[PDB]
Paper text:
Lysophospholipids are bioactive lipids and can signal through G-protein-coupled receptors (GPCRs). Here we report single-particle cryo-EM structures of human S1P receptor 1 (S1P1) and heterotrimeric Gi complexes formed with bound S1P or the multiple sclerosis (MS) treatment drug Siponimod, as well as human LPA receptor 1 (LPA1) and Gi complexes in the presence of LPA.
In S1P1, the ligand-binding site is a cylindrical concavity, 30° tilted relative to the membrane, pointing deep into the helical bundle core until the TM4-TM5 cleft, where the length of the pocket almost spans the entire outer leaflet of the lipid bilayer. In S1P1, the ECL0 is a flexible loop flipped to pack against ECL2 in the active conformation, which leads to an opening of the ligand access vestibule. From the inactive to the active conformation of S1P1, one essential change is the flipping of the side chain of F210 from the TM3-TM5 interface to the TM5-TM6 interface. In S1P1, the flip of F210 causes the rotameric change of L214, accompanied by the translational movement of W269 and F265 in TM6 to form new contacts. In its ICL2, L151 is inserted into the hydrophobic pocket at the end of the N-terminal helix of Gαi, and N153 forms hydrogen bonds with D350 and N347 from the α5 helix of Gαi. In ICL3, L235 and F237 contact the hydrophobic surface of Gαi, and K250 forms a salt bridge with D341 from the α5 helix of Gαi.
Residue numbers in the entry:
A (entry chain B): 3 to 340
B (entry chain G): 8 to 63
C (entry chain A): 7 to 56, 182 to 354
D (entry chain R): 18 to 37, 44 to 239, 248 to 323
The structure:
């Protein structure tokens, strides 16, 4: 009976709820009550990258902590050199409607995508030639929301068709498909080990996926709207989610339960980006109110503001060495902060 | 319908039987990790101006 | 030694970027929207004589147009609609012959009402407050023939008027234009399309010219 | 010479204005000038406090506002330092006092011309987006202020009635009648320029609109109303003083009595300087919202 097999699901929901509350021994705010606070984090604009003539929708750092790539709606993918500020490359995308950007760990390839439902991979180290398109991955039914390399041959992508996919750049075929989300997947984040990854969707939940097996290990709820951004904690045992309900939440994998909520009454707009600092003690979150707030991950108190943009901060990233923060916005500028 | 309900209940039963940990232990672990790496975070500890590539 | 070459290459890239930008700033941008079985394909086919998102370029009377059709996006629209903030106009297509047809719901959902709901959502959207809408009412001959057999009361039960083509057509136009709450910032240009018109490109051209004049007067402060 | 207290007395005696502290009408005019000053301060405060207003067109509007502010300040000073203070002044101080007024009013008129030129260029091009062509924005404002300074400070560096006493103006006894003729000609050219420019703007809009075919004017009538308001409020408020100066160049000393009551025409011109912000901020429909 369909009626009987629907009733059962509520029983397992109740069982999970109870098995989780049984683990609620003390809130993170208590175990972390006596640690000294961080103090005000004052950061200033070191650089200002100019050259985009439209909104900037994504950015990603390279593993070298010096080169970053940015994607704008003017149909340009620009590879900068943040130190000297000079444009190393400018790639004329075929589809101007890009909303994703990635930089391979090896520094050889860059990926992008968007409303074209395709993930384009451009090769940067081609013998005595200009940057040419290396590959085009086309198996998604919705727009491409996020993509991240695993190595020079594998890439994970999230789409608005409520599905994620692990690809094979050599053959261009979907190696694995991750299903289970009920809404559009808006962001994804790889773990340091590259064995698991979490995804946040518009169904107001996040899911942890196993890359090699393809199953959903755990599901996390609590947000009251779409989850726009998701980032991993440096040690790989927790993550953070920013939503349209003007709130961030910290989840722990081996607890299966929300730990902390970063919110404030004066903040009512949505969150567009979240990232951690190299130590994981700071949580930088970009907002639609044109600002980027620096939360203290272990406590709740806010500890900084990065106000430098005339339009909303759409993308936010931190270098692998933790030396600088990059912030893009709809005003067509990028800023580096120290 | 029926297959979708079966898939949902199977996923929920797979998510139920998981070895969980008390939130106190997880909080202690996060605190320990952040405390061990506090000296390697330029954003946390502004580095000397001579060693910062973006000021030089 | 290698820094000078780097700055040279960066200056060259900036030059190319400026050229490309000032060339792209001379193109009209149109966002094509409509219900399922509207005359989208007909409109794009008759305007081209001059798996994602389809882009159609064309030139008419020394003016270049880029029209973007995004009907193949079954995802939630509120997550990517803002990508089109700044287009020159929105071309919205509505099928008149849908006034007597039901949707896949097949219980109480009238297809014309679904199209009307979509138009109401798009017109009053927070991103499109100053952007004008070119409305194309398609299937006008099929409507003309159908409105002789089944009265228009099947849609808009609060309707009382002649059962002839001109009256009902004007009535539906007014209904679609009464949904415009932002009646002070944007306009709604309407035009009854057929399978064979030969003059829809002209209408889009004139509407865009009017929008350009209005934007210029707003730039000077003269309006 | 330029340090003789007797030159001013001799000229005022010759033109029939010799009279031997703040009178009935001075206070009301002073408060009107203060009102003008604060009005134009508001326009600059709002133009500079809003990121959307950082295009070249609000720079021209702000330039006009600055000119109107300077005109108000100059008129306050000229009204305080006139009257019984005229005989406590040196001819150099007298020349500075009058040149301040000439420079401020000329600057305001040239700012109106600059706004008209920018509007005419924007409509004629009729491009999809208007870029900030900064070269024109700095090459017009500089021309306005430079021409104003050269024209207003010309009598002090010669070209005055000191040597030849017959060529005196009744309204400004130490000025040359030919200088007043020169300034009136410049004003006439600027007025014709502004009228022609706005008429061509209206003609362009109407002609381009009439070629469009729609199913269901109103936008081209509002343009006519705004153009009519602008040109009427300019000509009406500047025509009395222009006619006064022409009459003042026309007749010989002591013949024309009306010339002695010239402080009404001047206050009307400064009233135009004060009315400009109302017209260039009421008909915008976007500065109204930014005000609050
Ligand atoms: C574009 C060119 C525009 C040209 C501008 C024309 C300027 C016209 C200003 C003419 C009047 C200047 C100020 C003179 C005022 C006198 O009436 C009193 N100061 C005399 O007062 P007394 O000392 O006798 O009491
Ligand atoms: C003014 O000039 C007239 C005619 O030259 C002269 O008779 C009269 O005495 C003069 N008055 C003064 C104060 O100089």
């Amino acid at each position: 009976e369909l009626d009987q097999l629907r009733q059962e699901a509520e029983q397992l929901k109740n069982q999970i709820r109870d098995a989780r509350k049984a683990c609620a021994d003390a809130t993170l705010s208590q175990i972390t009550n006596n640690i000294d606070p961080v103090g005000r984090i004052q950061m200033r604009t070191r650089r200002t990258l100019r050259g985009h003539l439209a909104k900037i929708y994504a950015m990603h750092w390279g593993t070298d902590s010096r080169l970053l790539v940015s994607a704008s709606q003017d149909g340009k993918l620009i590879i900068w050199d943040s130190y000297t500020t000079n444009k190393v490359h400018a790639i004329p995308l075929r589809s101007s409607w890009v909303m994703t950007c990635a930089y391979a760990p090896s520094g050889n390839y860059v990926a992008c995508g968007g409303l074209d439902n395709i993930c384009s991979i451009y090769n940067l180290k081609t013998r005595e030639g200009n940057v040419r398109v290396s590959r085009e991955l086309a198996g998604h039914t919705g727009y491409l929301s996020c993509c991240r390399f695993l190595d020079d041959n594998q890439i994970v992508t999230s789409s608005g068709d409520t599905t994620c996919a692990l690809w094979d750049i050599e053959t261009g075929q979907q190696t694995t498909t991750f299903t289970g989300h009920t809404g559009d997947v808006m962001s994804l984040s790889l773990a340091p080990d590259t064995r698991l990854f979490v995804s946040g969707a518009c169904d107001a939940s996040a899911k942890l996926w196993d890359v090699r097996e393809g199953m959903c290990r755990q599901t996390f709820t609590g947000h009251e709207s779409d989850i726009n951004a998701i980032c991993f904690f440096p040690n790989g045992n927790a993550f953070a989610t920013g939503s349209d309900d003007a709130t961030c939440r910290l989840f722990d994998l081996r607890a299966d339960q929300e730990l902390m909520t970063y919110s404030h009454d004066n903040i009512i707009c949505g969150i567009t980006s979240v990232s951690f600092s190299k130590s994981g003690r700071l949580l930088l979150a970009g907002y639609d109110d044109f600002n980027c707030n620096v939360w203290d991950a272990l406590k709740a108190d806010r500890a900084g503001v990065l106000a430098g943009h005339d339009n909303r901060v759409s993308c936010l990233g931190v270098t692998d060495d933790g030396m600088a923060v990059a912030t893009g916005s709809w005003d067509s500028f990028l800023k580096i902060w120290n | 319908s029926i297959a979708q309900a079966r898939k949902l209940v199977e996923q929920l039963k797979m998510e139920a039987n998981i070895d969980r940990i008390k939130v106190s232990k997880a909080a202690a672990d996060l605190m320990a990790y952040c405390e061990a790496h506090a000296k390697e975070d330029p954003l946390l500890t502004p580095v000397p101006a001579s060693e910062n590539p973006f000021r030089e | 030694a290698e820094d000078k070459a780097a700055v040279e290459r960066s200056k060259m890239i900036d030059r190319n970027l400026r050229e490309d930008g000032e060339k792209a700033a001379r193109e009209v941008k149109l966002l094509l929207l409509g219900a399922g079985e509207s005359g989208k394909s007909t409109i794009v086919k008759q305007m081209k004589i001059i798996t994602g998102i389809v882009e159609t370029h064309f030139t008419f009377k020394d003016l270049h147009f880029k029209m973007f059709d995004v009907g193949a996006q079954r995802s939630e629209r509120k997550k990517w609609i803002h990508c089109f903030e700044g287009v020159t106009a929105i071309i919205f297509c509505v099928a008149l012959s849908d006034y007597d047809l039901v949707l896949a719901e097949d219980e109480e959902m009238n297809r014309m009402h679904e199209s009307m709901k979509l138009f109401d959502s798009i017109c009053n959207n927070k991103w499109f407050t100053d952007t004008s809408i070119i409305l194309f009412l398609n299937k006008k001959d099929l409507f003309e023939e159908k409105i002789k057999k089944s009265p228009l009361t099947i849609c808009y039960p609060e309707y009382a008027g002649s059962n002839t083509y001109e009256e009902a057509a004007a009535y539906i136009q007014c209904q679609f234009e009464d949904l415009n709450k932002r009646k002070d910032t944007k306009e709604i240009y309407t035009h009854f399309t057929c399978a064979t018109d030969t003059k829809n490109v002209q209408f889009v051209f004139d509407a865009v010219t009017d929008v350009i004049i209005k934007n210029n007067l707003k730039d000077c402060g003269l309006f | 010479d330029y340090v003789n207290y007797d030159i001013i007395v001799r000229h005022y005696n010759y033109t029939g204005k010799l009279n031997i502290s703040i009178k009935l009408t001075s206070v009301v005019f002073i408060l009107i000038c203060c009102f003008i000053i604060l009005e134009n301060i508001f326009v600059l405060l709002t133009i500079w406090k809003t990121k959307k207003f950082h295009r070249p067109m609000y720079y021209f509007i702000g330039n006009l506002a600055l000119s109107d502010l300077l005109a108000g300040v100059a008129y306050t000073a000229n009204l305080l330092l006139s009257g019984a203070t005229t005989y406590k002044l040196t001819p150099a101080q007298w020349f500075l006092r009058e040149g301040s007024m000439f420079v401020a009013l000329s600057a305001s008129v040239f700012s109106l011309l600059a706004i008209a030129i920018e509007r005419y260029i924007t409509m004629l091009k009729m491009k999809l987006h208007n870029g900030s062509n900064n070269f024109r924005l700095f090459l017009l404002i500089s021309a306005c202020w430079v021409i104003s300074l050269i024209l207003g400070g010309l009598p002090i560096m010669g070209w005055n009635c000191i040597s030849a006493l017959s060529s005196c103006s009744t309204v400004l006894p130490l000025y040359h009648k030919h200088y007043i003729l020169f300034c009136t000609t410049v004003f006439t050219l600027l007025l014709l320029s502004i009228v022609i420019l706005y008429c061509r703007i209206y003609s362009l809009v109407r002609t381009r609109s009439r070629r469009l075919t729609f199913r269901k004017s109103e936008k081209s009538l509002a343009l006519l109303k705004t153009v009519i308001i602008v040109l009427s409020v300019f000509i009406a408020c500047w025509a009395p003083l222009f006619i006064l100066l022409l009459l003042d160049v026309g007749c010989k000393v002591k013949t024309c009595d009306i010339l002695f009551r010239a402080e009404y025409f001047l206050v009307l011109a400064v009233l135009n300087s004060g009315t400009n912000p109302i017209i260039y901020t009421l008909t915008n429909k976007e500065m109204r919202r930014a005000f609050i």
